[PDB]
């Protein structure tokens, strides 16, 4: 392979890219192996002088282009491993978010292998961020946001309500009160496309948890079956505050979605109102 690449690299560019680059890209995407040709990996190590690296330079850019081609084609785990070998936290977190965004819309219960794949990818990304320099400030903020969001998602899917409520209260990023709607809107202007798109599922899960809590509160007796009237009034007041903050946010943000989502938003607003 290297003996043929030594002759293929002699040709210059011909109508974009190069025939040698196209051939090596096809070969690597057909082989899917790089532990000795490009470099071994313990868990998140750097690159090693492989066979092609001991003869040709620009190995970092070559690996980056190969991983980009694989991502454009439809590869996830191998592209992530290649970028981890080439040491690129920005691209690693970018591909991680791009692969975990569409799965957020669907269920997150352990039913197939996509959840295990996203879990191992998140673990690899977090260990790479712990051992070495991570990504940019906004990228790390989005990573932490997505981590907290998938944590709340799995906590809600597992059947627990109080855990989801307390984690969504400790997140300190949902509209709390009217004085917090201002800073929430101010911070919303510095988000991203994924952070604006997953808000639909976030609000759906939040309204589901709130409706479950309200149904449990209505099933529980006001004076009997526990839960004193003062506790019921305090819960009703905190629900009023949360609904007012959420509706003020959704009304004064410069973004609209769909009629069904809007109707459900107002439904939860008046349910907690």
């Amino acid at each position: 392979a290297l003996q043929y690449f030594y002759f293929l690299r002699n040709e210059k560019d011909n109508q974009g890219e190069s025939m040698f680059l196209r051939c090596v890209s096809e070969l690597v995407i057909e082989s899917r192996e790089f532990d000795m040709l490009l470099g071994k990996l313990e868990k998140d190590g750097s690159r090693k002088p492989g066979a092609i690296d001991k003869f040709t330079r620009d190995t970092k850019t070559i690996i980056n282009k190969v991983a980009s081609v694989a991502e454009n084609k439809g590869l996830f785990e191998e592209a992530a491993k290649l970028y981890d070998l080439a040491k690129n936290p920005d691209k690693v977190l970018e591909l991680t978010n791009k692969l975990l965004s569409p799965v957020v819309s669907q269920i997150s219960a352990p039913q197939s292998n996509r959840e295990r794949l996203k879990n191992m990818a998140l673990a690899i990304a977090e260990r790479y961020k712990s051992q070495g320099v991570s990504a940019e400030k906004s990228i790390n903020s989005t990573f932490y946001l997505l981590l907290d969001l998938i944590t709340f998602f799995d906590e809600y899917h597992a059947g627990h309500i109080d855990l989801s409520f307390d984690v969504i209260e400790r997140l300190k990023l949902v509209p709390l009160s009217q004085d917090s709607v201002e800073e929430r809107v101010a911070a919303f202007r510095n988000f991203s496309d994924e952070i604006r798109h997953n808000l639909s599922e976030i609000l759906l899960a939040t309204m589901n948890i709130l409706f479950t809590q309200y149904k449990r509160l209505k099933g529980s007796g006001p004076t009997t079956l526990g839960r004193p009237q003062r506790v019921q009034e305090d819960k009703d007041s905190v629900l009023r505050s949360q609904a007012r903050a959420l509706i003020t946010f959704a009304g004064m943000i410069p973004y609209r979605m769909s009629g069904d989502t809007n109707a459900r938003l107002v439904q939860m607003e008046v349910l907690m109102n």
Binding site: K129, K137, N140, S141, A187, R230, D234, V238, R240
Partner: protein, 758 residues
């Protein structure tokens, strides 16, 4: 070493296959039996250690392991024989007698030889819980001959280690069973019992013993009786404090009722010829009962019965009464100074906390007592307080608070000087702790005034009186009060942010800063250990040998507080620290304090420069890798201020050079550095120089220099205005406001003149 049984067996068989000789097999039998014990294979461990002992009669650890395995299994006689032959082989073991005693106790057949061995071990060692339990199990089936030895061992252990709460409780129980109250009273009269007061059951037993002694000796009034009454009241107060700390309501109400009954009983002797330590402890317990009633009201509001909006006023009145409780008076006949000092310090702390809480809750009031006296004459107020506390169970005459009114105590108002004096009195016995310091900082921030942390740290640390020589270098020897002030400000800001996030809700709001029984610690164990190590290293209380370990433990957390990579706080908080340090070093007019402040600021800036470069290049942020809480992007620095931060570092360098004694060099450095803050400092220095020249003489050269300085200041203000109008990123980091800049430019132009101005 501890894994699965399958892995243990696989390792054992691999080692056995690797061993090619029975001698080596029996030699590795030690680790074989160890792995057998970790995997719960007692018979195999026993046979392995037996083969090891048979092939080598050395190492007492193997004999001890064999004895432990025999005790676990059931070969008491074999274990005793093995221990005896091991002691005969090597008589240089002390725990072998304890192991023999444990084996005999497991056999449940006590022996005189074991009794003598444990007696020898107790005569050798100063005391041990193991030997205590051994003696208890041995003499639990003997008689008075064993009871005497047990009492002697308990006395020896109490003389050795005074921190023996369970031992003291067992001794008191044995005394009460054998009908001996004098020895129990003599043991409870010790001064260390105040510190031992930690278990509610032990405190209740002490209270019962003291009540029995009082009922038996009712008829004498001496200093011993005063001390016994004070200890009884302290134990009752500790019981009430524990009930308020733990989550309940009925237990706290019963404890408050018992405290009120004890106070009503002691009020009979209060009104007598007792006007010294007895009255001091009576006022102390009255203030403690007021604060405990407030805490019980808060606990009931937490358990949901009456809301905070209706229970704050009774709690505020109780705090006001506790603050108005008279101070401990003097005693004409001394004798209980060790208790009088503790009571005085407790009064100091109570007055401090009550005044601080009342000030934070009222925001300025003093006419409430006068209005109550003029309206209800305190009688209806006390009746309402009793009805809110004890409902309708206790009558008005069955409590000491029903007969007393607000006019019975003093009528002093919480003042700043009194609060500072009480805080100093509390600190003189607290010896420095970050909890109350953060609490006082939060109180000062709520009162909207700067906290005097300088004098507090000066009186805490008797070695650093705001005078140090080491400023730079990340070393533990360069630790001054500025790092401690920065840490205290960090904890205060964290607590304030937590309180602000908790208050932003429709839930019924709580008063600011919850009391101690309902407020857990917010710091971390690592931070507490670092603070303790720093205190021990500064106060010269280290040990010859552990100094390097203490310095390493200090540096492990100082590498983050010294503004270096891999943080635990926030870059915006570090920038605020640096700005506050520079402001405190530039606004004063001393010498040594300003030099230390600017040196610490210069060190922080020169250590943060890599983080500033990283923020400029837009890379990683301080990830939560260290146990130093966690924040968000709302308190983080931006990317359009890295040049401003570098220029502020250069400004700090130039200010340090100016104070060192290089005025012209610092002026040249300030002129070379391009920054709005640099030009503002240049204008301030030029104004100060012009004032000094006008105060002194005015030669031709000095007049020309002053004119040139005024022209340079005018040009710097003009270029500041131009940069603010052009580059919008400079407006995100502005020292003095635009109005202040404009008024300074106007004053400079008016002092200079027209025509020549621009």
């Amino acid at each position: 070493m501890r894994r699965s049984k399958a892995e243990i067996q696989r390792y054992v068989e691999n080692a056995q296959n690797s061993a090619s000789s029975p001698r080596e097999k029996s030699m590795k039998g030690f680790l074989f039996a160890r792995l057998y014990y970790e995997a719960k294979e007692y018979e195999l461990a026993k046979r392995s250690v037996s083969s090891y002992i048979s092939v080598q009669e050395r190492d007492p650890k193997a004999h001890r392991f064999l004895g432990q395995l025999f005790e676990i299994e059931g070969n008491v006689e074999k274990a005793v024989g093995c221990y005896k032959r091991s002691l005969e082989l090597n008589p240089t073991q002390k725990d072998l007698t304890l192991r023999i005693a444990e084996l005999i106790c497991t056999l449940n057949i006590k022996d005189g030889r074991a009794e003598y061995w444990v007696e020898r071990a107790s005569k050798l060692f100063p005391g041990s819980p193991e030997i205590y339990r051994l003696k208890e199990q041995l003499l639990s089936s003997q008689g008075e001959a064993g009871w005497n030895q047990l009492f002697d061992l308990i006395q020896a252990e109490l003389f050795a280690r005074p921190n023996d709460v369970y031992v003291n409780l067992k001794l008191v129980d044995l005394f009460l069973s054998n009908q001996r109250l004098e020895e129990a009273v003599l043991h409870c009269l010790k001064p260390e019992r105040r510190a031992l007061r930690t278990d509610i059951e032990w405190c209740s037993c002490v209270v019962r013993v003291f009540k029995e002694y009082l009922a038996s000796k009712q008829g004498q009034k001496n200093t011993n009786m005063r001390m016994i009454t004070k200890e009884l009241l302290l134990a009752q107060c500790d019981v009430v404090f524990l009930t308020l700390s733990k989550k309940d309501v009925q237990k706290s109400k019963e404890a408050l009722e018992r405290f009120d009954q004890a106070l009503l009983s002691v009020k009979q002797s209060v009104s007598g010829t007792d006007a010294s330590d007895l009255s001091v402890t009576f006022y102390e317990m009255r203030g403690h009962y007021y604060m405990h009633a407030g805490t019980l009201l808060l606990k009931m509001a937490q358990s949901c019965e009456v809301q905070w909006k209706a229970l704050i006023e009774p709690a505020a009145l109780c705090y006001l009464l506790a603050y108005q409780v008279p101070k401990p008076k003097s005693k004409p006949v001394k004798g209980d100074d060790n208790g009088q000092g503790f009571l005085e310090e407790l009064a100091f702390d109570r007055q401090s906390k009550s005044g601080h809480l009342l000030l934070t809750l009222s925001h300025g009031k003093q006419n409430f007592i006068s209005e109550i006296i003029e309206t209800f004459a305190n009688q209806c107020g006390q009746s309402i307080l009793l009805k809110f506390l004890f409902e309708d169970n206790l009558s008005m005459q069955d409590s000491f608070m029903g007969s007393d009114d607000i006019s019975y105590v003093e009528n002093r108002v919480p003042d700043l000087s009194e609060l500072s004096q009480h805080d100093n009195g509390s600190l003189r016995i607290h010896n420095g702790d970050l909890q109350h310091l953060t609490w006082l900082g939060l109180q000062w921030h709520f009162l909207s005034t700067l906290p005097p942390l300088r004098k507090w740290l000066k009186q805490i640390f008797p070695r650093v009186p705001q005078e140090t020589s080491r400023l730079e270098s990340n070393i533990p020897e360069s630790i001054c009060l500025l790092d401690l002030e920065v840490f205290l400000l960090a904890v205060v800001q964290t607590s304030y942010l937590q309180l602000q996030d908790n208050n932003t809700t429709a839930d019924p709001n709580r008063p600011r800063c919850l009391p101690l029984p309902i407020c857990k610690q917010l710091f971390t164990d690592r931070q507490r250990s670092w603070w303790d190590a720093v205190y021990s290293l500064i106060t010269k209380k280290a040990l010859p040998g552990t100094s390097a370990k203490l310095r390493s433990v200090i540096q492990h957390d100082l590498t983050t507080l010294r503004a270096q990579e891999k943080h635990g706080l926030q870059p915006a908080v570090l920038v605020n620290w640096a700005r506050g340090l520079h402001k405190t070093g530039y606004s004063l007019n001393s010498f040594y304090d300003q030099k230390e402040y600017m040196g610490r600021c210069v060190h922080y800036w020169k250590k943060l420069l890599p983080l500033l470069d990283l923020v400029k290049q837009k890379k990683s942020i301080p990830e939560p890798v260290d146990p130093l809480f966690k924040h968000f992007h709302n308190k983080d620095i931006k990317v359009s201020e890295v040049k401003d931060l570098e220029d502020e570092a250069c400004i700090a360098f130039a200010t340090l050079d100016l104070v060192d004694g290089k005025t012209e060099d610092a002026i040249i450095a300030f002129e070379s550095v391009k920054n709005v803050v640099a030009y503002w400092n240049l204008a301030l220095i030029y104004q100060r120089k012009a004032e000094e020249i006008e105060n002194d003489c005015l030669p031709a050269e000095e007049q020309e220099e002053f004119q040139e300085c005024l022209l340079k200041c005018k040009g710097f203000l003009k270029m500041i205005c131009d940069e603010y109008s052009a580059y919008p990123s400079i407006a995100t980091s502005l020292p003095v406001p635009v109005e202040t800049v404009f008024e300074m430019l106007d004053s400079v132009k008016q002092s200079l003149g027209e025509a020549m101005d621009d």
